[PDB]
Design a protein around this nucleic acid. Structure first.
Lengths: 79, 482
DNA sequence: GGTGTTGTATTACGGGCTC
DNA sequence: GGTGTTGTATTACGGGCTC
DNA sequence: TATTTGTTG
DNA sequence: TCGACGAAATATAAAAATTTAAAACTAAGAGAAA
DNA sequence: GAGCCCGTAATACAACAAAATCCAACAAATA
DNA sequence: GAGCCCGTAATACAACAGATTTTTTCTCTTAGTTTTAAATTTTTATATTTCGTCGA
């Protein structure tokens, strides 16, 4: 179904976001806001051809920036 | 109670013989005692934490076989402060402190023996409330909703004030015969003795008489002219407005879905008039479980489930509706009711964003989305970013300002931004307000967003939707307006 | 006329001891 | 956290009689 | 004479 | 070992102009399990 | 002990245990 | 009674009762499609980062 295809993509996004968050040490509500921003990105005809780490890093950064915190893009790019 | 020394010649110490094995002078002809002990002790129980010269084991005394008649006599004699009351209340108050193995048989045996001592002479052969007088009502206008379902039958209890929204198939096809089938489909609660639906004179209630003659119920569905003293017409009026508000929402996953939640929330709210909520005005239990866990989307095995659950938490909308319509304020205070607005909160502005024009029979009342305020000039001139600062497109008067754009919990969906967003989210709509008078632009209500926010549609993405019903309802709203 | 029937863990009953 | 459960013929046990 | 159609380990 | 300068990397807004993924989105295919 | 009537009233015993296709093969029914 | 060892020996309890395909959703797995955005050039003034080099 149309709603069935969304769930697998959202599950993959959640898995990758949690995998990065396990090394970023960010709280739960930041990850929740990042996942809702990822849902908004998919609703905006999500940018295809981009690397997966780029878009999840952008969503994680905008979620960590929407509340005043300390994380820097180098920490996102430290692998 | 009667004594602190139990009589050992009974089943009590024989049950106490589970693991301590005191002594076995059970009784004369004790065939029942040992089989009862072995069966009801070796199989499941393993209870009765043993105590010396005590029968507390649970928190109830284990009354002996010899002592039961005396304690029941002292508990029942009205001269000895017993009351001689009914079986139910005596049975309830006799077992928080007494165990009485086979309590019910002993109680009913004592009652059927002592009835000759105190005979009761209530009349056997030959007065309102709790599904005795009932009334059901129809609705007038309602969308087809993807399965030609355009009907809602509210059934208002005359006493308990409990409603039931049913018969959501068709306006006329489920009105001759199937309305009897629908009254029968919620009549598993019970068969009312009188129905006073009060909608119109019908060929129905003749076939209803056929079913109640096929069964033995003496019901009647006369509904001669109307019951209308003071309040039932008011109840109908206030009921239909909420159902018309359901009419004014949810064009996909329609009101034929999640209507039970609407019924639960309606009968869960306290009436505030003459008593409490309908689920406790006749039933008396079942807290509503208000928490629906509208959080933790990152920990979710099914994200469609949490999306629809976040939709399920729209009960705040219904409660706000029935609280504000429970529906006025203080006159002439509204001019002073605008107050000091702090920098940072999102501000909603009226129609004159940069152009003020003749909006299409305007019922949107603020017409656009929120913006952020950064500076204020005076008490009647606030700066907030709408357009480029050419020709002063930045500041407007406070009469064109509002304050409140909050509660994302009650409104799950965000604000759509782009056309490519709008193409995909186009098939999630609530209402259509009016075409923008400039050239062609549509103004609409979307679903699961607050009605204050509005979303702009053009004809490019307007061809991929069920929009026939949208401009149909806009046309009949224009007919009502002019 | 022609219409259940044994394998199997499980458990109950006698010789021999303490009485 | 999460793990059987009642409908049904059939049969067993007290008041009242003979003792 | 081939294709069916009742019932039964 | 503090000062002095050179210089690529980005944005930037377009017009463009060949190859490279690339991740949503369908669609078998097995495996459950009343 | 010894049994009987009668009136309740316990009492193990089995049914819910997904539903419905045929497989192979006797013999009836036409046309 | 009261139990125990051990050695035989009865003892109710259950399996054989035609076996297989379907029926209706769901949920990983794994290969094919589609839309779309992106790898090397000009370039233009702006600015800051990070090397990179040089000097007394």
């Amino acid at each position: 179904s149309a709603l069935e295809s969304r769930e697998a993509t959202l599950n993959n996004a959640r898995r990758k976001l949690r995998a990065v968050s396990y090394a970023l040490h960010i709280p739960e509500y930041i990850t929740d806001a990042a996942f809702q921003w990822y849902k908004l990105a998919l609703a905006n005809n999500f940018v295809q051809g981009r690397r997966s780490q780029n878009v999840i890093a952008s969503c994680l950064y905008v979620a960590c920036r929407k509340e005043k915190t300390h994380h820097m893009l180098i920490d996102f790019s430290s692998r | 109670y009667y004594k602190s020394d139990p009589l050992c010649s009974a089943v009590l110490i024989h049950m106490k013989e589970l693991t301590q094995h005191n002594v076995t002078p059970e009784d004369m002809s004790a065939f029942r005692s040992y089989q009862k002990k072995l069966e009801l002790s070796e199989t499941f129980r393993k209870n009765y934490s043993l105590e010396d010269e005590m029968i507390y084991y649970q928190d109830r005394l284990v009354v002996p076989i010899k002592q039961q008649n005396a304690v029941m006599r002292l508990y029942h004699d009205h001269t000895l402060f017993g009351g001689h009351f009914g079986v139910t209340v005596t049975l309830a108050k006799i077992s928080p402190i007494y165990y009485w193995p086979k309590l019910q048989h002993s109680i009913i045996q004592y009652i059927r023996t002592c009835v000759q001592c105190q005979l009761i002479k209530s009349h056997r052969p030959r007065a309102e409330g709790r599904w005795l007088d009932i009334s059901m009502d129809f609705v007038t206008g309602l969308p087809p909703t993807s399965n030609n379902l355009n009907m809602i039958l509210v059934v208002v209890d005359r006493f308990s004030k409990r409603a039931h929204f049913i018969a959501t198939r068709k306006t006329l096809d489920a009105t001759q015969l199937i309305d009897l089938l629908f009254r029968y489909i919620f009549s598993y609660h019970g068969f009312p003795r009188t129905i006073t639906s009060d909608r119109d004179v019908r060929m129905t209630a003749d076939k209803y008489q056929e079913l109640t003659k096929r069964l033995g119920i003496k019901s009647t569905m006369s509904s001669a002219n109307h019951p209308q003293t003071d309040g039932q017409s008011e109840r109908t009026i206030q009921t239909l407005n909420r159902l018309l508000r359901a009419y004014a929402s949810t064009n996909i996953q329609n009101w034929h879905v999640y209507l039970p939640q609407i019924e639960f929330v309606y009968n869960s709210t306290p009436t505030r008039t003459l008593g409490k909520s309908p689920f406790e005005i006749d039933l008396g239990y079942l807290p509503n479980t208000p928490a629906i866990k509208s959080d933790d989307e990152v920990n979710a095995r099914s994200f469609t489930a949490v999306e629809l659950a976040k939709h399920l938490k729209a009960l705040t909308i219904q409660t706000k509706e029935q609280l504000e319509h429970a529906e006025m304020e203080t006159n002439n205070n509204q001019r002073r009711k605008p107050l000091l607005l702090n920098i940072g909160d999102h501000v909603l502005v009226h129609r004159d964003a940069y152009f003020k024009k003749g909006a299409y029979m305007k019922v949107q009342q603020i017409y656009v989305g929120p913006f952020r305020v950064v500076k204020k000039i005076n008490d009647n001139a606030y700066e907030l970013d709408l357009n480029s600062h050419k020709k002063k497109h930045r500041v407007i008067n406070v009469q064109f300002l509002k304050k409140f754009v909050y509660r994302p919990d009650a409104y799950p969906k965000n604000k759509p931004i782009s056309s490519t967003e709008r193409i995909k989210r186009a098939h999630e709509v609530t209402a259509l307000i009016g075409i923008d008078t400039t050239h062609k632009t549509y103004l609409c209500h979307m679903q699961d967003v607050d009605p204050t926010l509005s979303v702009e549609y053009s004809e490019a993405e307007f061809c991929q939707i069920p929009e026939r019903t949208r401009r149909s309802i806009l046309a009949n709203f224009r007919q009502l307006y002019e």
